[PDB]
Amino acid sequence: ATPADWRSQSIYFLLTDRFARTDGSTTATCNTADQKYCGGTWQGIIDKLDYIQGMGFTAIWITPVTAQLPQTTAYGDAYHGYWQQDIYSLNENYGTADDLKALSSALHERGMYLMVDVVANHMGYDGAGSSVDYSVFKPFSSQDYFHPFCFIQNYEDQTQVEDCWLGDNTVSLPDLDTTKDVVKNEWYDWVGSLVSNYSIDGLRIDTVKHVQKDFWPGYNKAAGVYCIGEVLDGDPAYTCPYQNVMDGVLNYPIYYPLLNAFKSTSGSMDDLYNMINTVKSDCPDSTLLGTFVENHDNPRFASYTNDIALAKNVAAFIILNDGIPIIYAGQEQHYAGGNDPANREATWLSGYPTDSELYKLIASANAIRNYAISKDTGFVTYKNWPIYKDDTTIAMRKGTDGSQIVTILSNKGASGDSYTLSLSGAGYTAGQQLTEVIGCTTVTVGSDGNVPVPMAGGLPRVLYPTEKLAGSKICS
Numbered sequence: 001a002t003p004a005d006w007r008s009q010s011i012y013f014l015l016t017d018r019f020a021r022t023d024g025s026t027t028a029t030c031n032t033a034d035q036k037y038c039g040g041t042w043q044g045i046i047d048k049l050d051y052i053q054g055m056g057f058t059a060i061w062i063t064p065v066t067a068q069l070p071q072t073t074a075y076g077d078a079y080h081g082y083w084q085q086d087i088y089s090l091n092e093n094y095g096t097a098d099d100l101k102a103l104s105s106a107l108h109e110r111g112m113y114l115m116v117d118v119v120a121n122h123m124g125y126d127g128a129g130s131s132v133d134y135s136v137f138k139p140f141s142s143q144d145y146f147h148p149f150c151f152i153q154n155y156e157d158q159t160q161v162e163d164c165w166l167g168d169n170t171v172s173l174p175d176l177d178t179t180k181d182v183v184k185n186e187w188y189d190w191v192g193s194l195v196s197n198y199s200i201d202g203l204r205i206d207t208v209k210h211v212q213k214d215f216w217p218g219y220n221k222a223a224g225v226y227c228i229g230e231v232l233d234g235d236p237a238y239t240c241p242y243q244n245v246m247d248g249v250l251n252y253p254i255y256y257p258l259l260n261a262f263k264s265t266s267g268s269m270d271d272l273y274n275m276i277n278t279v280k281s282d283c284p285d286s287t288l289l290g291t292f293v294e295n296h297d298n299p300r301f302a303s304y305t306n307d308i309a310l311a312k313n314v315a316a317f318i319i320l321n322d323g324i325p326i327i328y329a330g331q332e333q334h335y336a337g338g339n340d341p342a343n344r345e346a347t348w349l350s351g352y353p354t355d356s357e358l359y360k361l362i363a364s365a366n367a368i369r370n371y372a373i374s375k376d377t378g379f380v381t382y383k384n385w386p387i388y389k390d391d392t393t394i395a396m397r398k399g400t401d402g403s404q405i406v407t408i409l410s411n412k413g414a415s416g417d418s419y420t421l422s423l424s425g426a427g428y429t430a431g432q433q434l435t436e437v438i439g440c441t442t443v444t445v446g447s448d449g450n451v452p453v454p455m456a457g458g459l460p461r462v463l464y465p466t467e468k469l470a471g472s473k474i475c476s
């Protein structure tokens, strides 16, 4: 599927090992500190697609599928998929080639997309760099395919960032020499044939800043689908230029101020407001970025605060910002694990309740986004506009005049006071009825064009014209 096709999608990101077992158990042990395979599979995902689609996601992102180093290392198993050895075999822990094809087909029957995580930068190996037997790597079965062994120490030296190895002396990540035509040609053939064998709709490309930029146009073209890159840097002047070589990147620039704004009742709305406007202006296309606050490489949102109002607001922002929403399996059950491995909790241990507070919030927010997109072909290309901020509030507008979603978010938290915010710049006409689609109340635009927004409980407010909701299932 093309970049234009992906703009309307909403992604549920999951670890194949951690989301759902074939046996469907909600009690099978998964101690994250053991760092071992817990037994999640592709078949398990298929069996729980109603759970994912019930929150109004249109797509899933799954962790890498290639065969891995076999060892239980000092840091545990390759459960996560980022330690590959044989790129032409699958990780048998997750199932068979027919199971991965059955997952793609099950998503397609539901009108959903499959996105697969891929690594081009590195293989994995149990042990020090000097102990590597290069013959285990397929097809790269020679030291001749790799950069000489060194670690990245100077992260300001972009040459060192690209040419030296990730990992450490315990688990090494042998660095492919992606400047070699033979390495480019194998990777380009591989990614095209992976996409066509498993009918994959899009790719999440890990580790993009560790491979020189001239590799990536050819890779994105060989894949034949939308690619979103992991460029792990909060500076839009570093990260956004990668969109000149790849369709999209993960929005790490928004990540840091978004987390800061909502993790505390003292968070900076100014930093978030300013970063939205920096990304909108200075990134090649904000509408092809991926918005997130939670992943398997940072502490979960609830590890910073268990306030459920704050969690509702940050989830609403993720769904209503420019670009593709990305929610990490467990976020919807308010999982609170810290840094790796504590943030790789099994989703099944929640019991997959569809009545939890954040399942309902995310369902409500995806519902209005999906509905608005179905009625407004300009929604996804209208650049999100922050129209108001104060010490505890940000408000933003997105969509075609007359059909715009106007979102008011707060960091007051669950003990926030009850008051009316008089909101200017929403763009609706005097006397217009709006539905607040999270709580299903109505507000009326005043003769002056200001919206009197009832604020209470620190709750997020998402406004849409009541007249435009004719025939939707929203706030029935």
Ligand SMILES: *[C@H]1[C@H](O)[C@@H](O)[C@H](O[C@H]2O[C@H](CO)[C@@H](O)[C@H](O)[C@H]2O)[C@@H](CO)[C@@H]1OS(=O)(=O)O
Residues within 6 Å of the ligand: 075, 080, 082, 083, 166, 167, 171, 173, 206, 207, 208, 210, 230, 232, 296, 297, 340
């Ligand atoms: C990207 C991927 O998103 C990230 O999770 C990868 O980390 C993996 O490997 C490290 C190092 O061995 C483990 O500590 C971790 O548990 C495991 O998930 C990462 C490195 O392989 C990927 O690349 S990047 O370093 O983020 O660029």
Ligand SMILES: *[C@@H]1O[C@H](CO)[C@@H](O)[C@H](O)[C@H]1NC(C)=O
Residues within 6 Å of the ligand: 087, 088, 190, 193, 194, 197
């Ligand atoms: C896809 O299948 C083809 C034909 O059997 C094969 O040549 C190729 O290696 C496969 N690619 C992958 C990534 O498995």
Ligand SMILES: [Ca+2]
Residues within 6 Å of the ligand: 121, 161, 162, 163, 164, 175, 176, 210, 211
């Ligand atoms: Ca590299």
